[PDB]
Amino acid sequence: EADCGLRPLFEKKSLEDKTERELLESYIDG
Amino acid sequence: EADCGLRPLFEKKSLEDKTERELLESYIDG
Amino acid sequence: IVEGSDAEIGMSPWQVMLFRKSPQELLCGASLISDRWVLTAAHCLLYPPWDKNFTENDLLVRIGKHSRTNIEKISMLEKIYIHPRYNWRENLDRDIALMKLKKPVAFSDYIHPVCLPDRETAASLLQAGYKGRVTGWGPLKETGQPSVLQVVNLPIVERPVCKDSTRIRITDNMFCAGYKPDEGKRGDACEGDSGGPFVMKSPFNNRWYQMGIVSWGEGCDRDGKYGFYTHVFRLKKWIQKVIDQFGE
Amino acid sequence: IVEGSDAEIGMSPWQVMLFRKSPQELLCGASLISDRWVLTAAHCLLYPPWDKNFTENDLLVRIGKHSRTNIEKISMLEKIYIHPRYNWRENLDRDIALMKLKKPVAFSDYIHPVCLPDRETAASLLQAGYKGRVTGWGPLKETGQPSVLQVVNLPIVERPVCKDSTRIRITDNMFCAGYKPDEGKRGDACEGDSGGPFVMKSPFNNRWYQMGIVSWGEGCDRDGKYGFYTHVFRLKKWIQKVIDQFGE
Ligand SMILES: *[C@@H]1O[C@H](CO)[C@@H](O)[C@H](O)[C@H]1NC(C)=O
Ligand SMILES: *[C@@H]1O[C@H](CO)[C@@H](O)[C@H](O)[C@H]1NC(C)=O
Ligand code: NA
Ligand code: NA
Ligand code: NA
Ligand code: NA
């Protein structure tokens, strides 16, 4: 639905969880 | 500052501008 | 979840637990995709090889549970929809089911739906090496019971390697993930993690998307073996049909 | 901007225009990085080879302007800070300057600051082939005057190729961008685009970061030539010093 996938305690507060960077790095790493 | 880089008429309204996908694709493309 | 770690509070607000109503028995994982729909694996509900064939009145789902040791919502089911071509006879092809909640659930800091992928998101992120995240209350291995939700990040594996790891006929409605022997990291879903979500965070819009459903594997966190997941995008048309047409 | 297109309304709310106060003359581009600080190229303010040496009272900046043919804010400057090691004598190394607004500006749908990169963002996105976006009111080439802000997306170029394209000694405080001959796309900043921002959208947090400042180039959109930009992250410590210590 329209607010899907944005977590109240993380994305909505501009806070990163402990390992999400590991996921995103895997997508951009060459 | 804390709300930097999030555009009122785009990111803040969940709307994509016409070519931003071109930028993001260049970062994840293999 | 084997070789994972404790999830932070509110890290997985779409996490749902599927329980036998009475007596209490944790059966599988599941996910919240709207205020009234929960997604899970069909084998969590219907699996004759196991004499399993649950109906709506036999179950309950819990939403918003971070640990064992309120704020937790317990919901009844109104209707179950299993993909008509789910194949429990051979290889668990199309292992997917939707469960409609009797009443819509209220969202909170701990309860929030996950997005389902569109063609662009699937094309971009379903690539070998790209990491997803699996969460669950399955044991800590195959002997080990968590009191806090466990989480593990695993990379998607090239199809030829997935094919190679098993004798079972795999299909394009499945994908596999996990580390290779020698990549030096471990991790896998296990037992009760079945039905739970495999999610990825979009670099395009920062939202979490559910790309897979824990489906099957052989053993748990074994070298040379990988977990198989239901390819959610491949079955999107059926998912959409059910949600769009029904849900009254 | 050469070979670009009309910007959508509110697409670049950090865009700032630097003007000679009286008589009116558009001098350069610039960017809003907070309610009271604007970032630009030092050569837009100090460039002796051109007998240019503007002081605070000689200028005005406009913020929030989408086109030519209210909602637009005109601000006076209180103080200009040019990097102490800006080299106008040889190669425009450290071509960067900060301008403090006399009064803080109010943010709106058309006025909003851009982020400055941290080490992680710079390491991740400053890679050959990765595209950034440049915006400006420069002419449409080198003969062509826009009434709507122009935008163009350009890929960062490998350093050996940047070095190769010019006789000037380039430094690690610069990076270059633009399409190669045969990549089949065109585009470049030009003249008055000078001082404007080169931005990239983070896949980590969905925010726009200013990675560069239009600095110099030889010609505009010429085959085999690339635009050079001030490497903002490399000069972050000085930027931070100025903003952190002053700004009263
Ligand atoms: C599950 O049980 C129902 C009875 O409500 C039956 O109609 C359906 O065919 C069963 N599925 C099996 C045993 O495969
Ligand atoms: C610019 O003008 C000021 C006078 O306020 C002078 O002190 C400074 O040295 C000048 N910069 C030049 C000419 O390089
Ligand atoms: Na990349
Ligand atoms: Na990639
Ligand atoms: Na394994
Ligand atoms: Na060129």
Side-chain angles (χ1 to χ4, degrees), chain D residues 93-143:
Chain D
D93 176 59
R94 288 170 166 91
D95 190 11
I96 189 170
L98 280 162
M99 303 179 290
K100 202 253 166 209
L101 305 183
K102 246 194 155 82
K103 290 172 180 46
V105 63
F107 299 159
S108 73
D109 283 347
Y110 315 104
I111 295 173
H112 199 88
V114 70
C115 303
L116 292 195
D118 49 15
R119 188 166 297 131
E120 305 96 294
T121 300
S124 296
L125 306 188
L126 251 28
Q127 306 285 161
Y130 284 30
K131 299 182 182 169
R133 167 181 294 169
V134 181
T135 41
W137 290 94
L140 304 193
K141 74 284 173 220
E142 348 176 34
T143 173

Side-chain angles (χ1 to χ4, degrees), chain C residues 16-205:
Chain C
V16 176
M17 301 167 91
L18 177 65
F19 282 88
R20 165 194 305 271
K21 176 189 296 183
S22 184
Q24 183 190 52
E25 191 194 347
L26 176 61
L27 301 177
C28 275
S31 61
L32 190 68
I33 61 167
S34 86
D35 67 352
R36 71 198 63 195
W37 291 100
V38 171
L39 186 65
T40 193
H43 82 261
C44 286
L45 301 167
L46 175 65
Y47 195 60
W50 241 138
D51 198 38
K52 183 187 309 266
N53 183 353
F54 292 108
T55 68
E56 295 76 6
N57 291 338
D58 302 325
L59 319 153
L60 287 179
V61 292
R62 288 202 205 175
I63 312 168
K65 184 144 150 32
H66 166 69
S67 34
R68 259 148 193 191
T69 116
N70 231 132
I71 305 329
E72 178 162 59
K73 174 59 183 158
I74 298 190
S75 301
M76 291 164 75
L77 307 178
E78 178 192 314
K79 188 64 186 294
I80 287 158
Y81 303 81
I82 291 167
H83 194 293
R85 295 172 56 187
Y86 157 54
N87 191 348
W88 49 265
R89 222 158 305 102
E90 183 177 84
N91 57 1
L92 287 193
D93 176 59
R94 288 170 166 91
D95 190 11
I96 189 170
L98 280 162
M99 303 179 290
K100 202 253 166 209
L101 305 183
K102 246 194 155 82
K103 290 172 180 46
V105 63
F107 299 159
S108 73
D109 283 347
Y110 315 104
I111 295 173
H112 199 88
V114 70
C115 303
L116 292 195
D118 49 15
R119 188 166 297 131
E120 305 96 294
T121 300
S124 296
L125 306 188
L126 251 28
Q127 306 285 161
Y130 284 30
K131 299 182 182 169
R133 167 181 294 169
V134 181
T135 41
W137 290 94
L140 304 193
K141 74 284 173 220
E142 348 176 34
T143 173
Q145 196 48 29
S147 66
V148 187
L149 174 72
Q150 296 294 286
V151 58
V152 69
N153 299 328
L154 304 169
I156 291 175
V157 174
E158 320 90 274
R159 193 159 293 273
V161 171
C162 295
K163 272 217 83 82
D164 259 15
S165 69
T166 173
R167 282 154 85 277
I168 293 75
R169 174 192 77 115
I170 67 166
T171 71
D172 285 345
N173 296 311
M174 306 166 192
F175 69 83
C176 90
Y179 289 99
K180 289 172 169 149
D182 290 312
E183 253 183 312
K185 291 201 191 59
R186 310 195 67 75
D188 194 15
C190 193
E191 309 289 41
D193 289 331
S194 229
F198 177 97
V199 306
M200 298 180 88
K201 182 165 177 170
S202 173
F204 298 106
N205 61 194

Side-chain angles (χ1 to χ4, degrees), chain D residues 17-28 50 52 54 58-60 62 68:
Chain D
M17 301 167 91
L18 177 65
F19 282 88
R20 165 194 305 271
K21 176 189 296 183
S22 184
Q24 183 190 52
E25 191 194 347
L26 176 61
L27 301 177
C28 275
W50 241 138
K52 183 187 309 266
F54 292 108
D58 302 325
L59 319 153
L60 287 179
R62 288 202 205 175
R68 259 148 193 191

Side-chain angles (χ1 to χ4, degrees), chain D residues 182-222:
Chain D
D182 290 312
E183 253 183 312
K185 291 201 191 59
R186 310 195 67 75
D188 194 15
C190 193
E191 309 289 41
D193 289 331
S194 229
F198 177 97
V199 306
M200 298 180 88
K201 182 165 177 170
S202 173
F204 298 106
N205 61 194
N206 235 76
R207 297 170 188 269
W208 291 84
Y209 284 87
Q210 181 175 170
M211 311 305 297
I213 298 168
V214 181
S215 185
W216 60 277
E218 72 244 289
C220 295
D221 195 39
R222 281 180 215 199

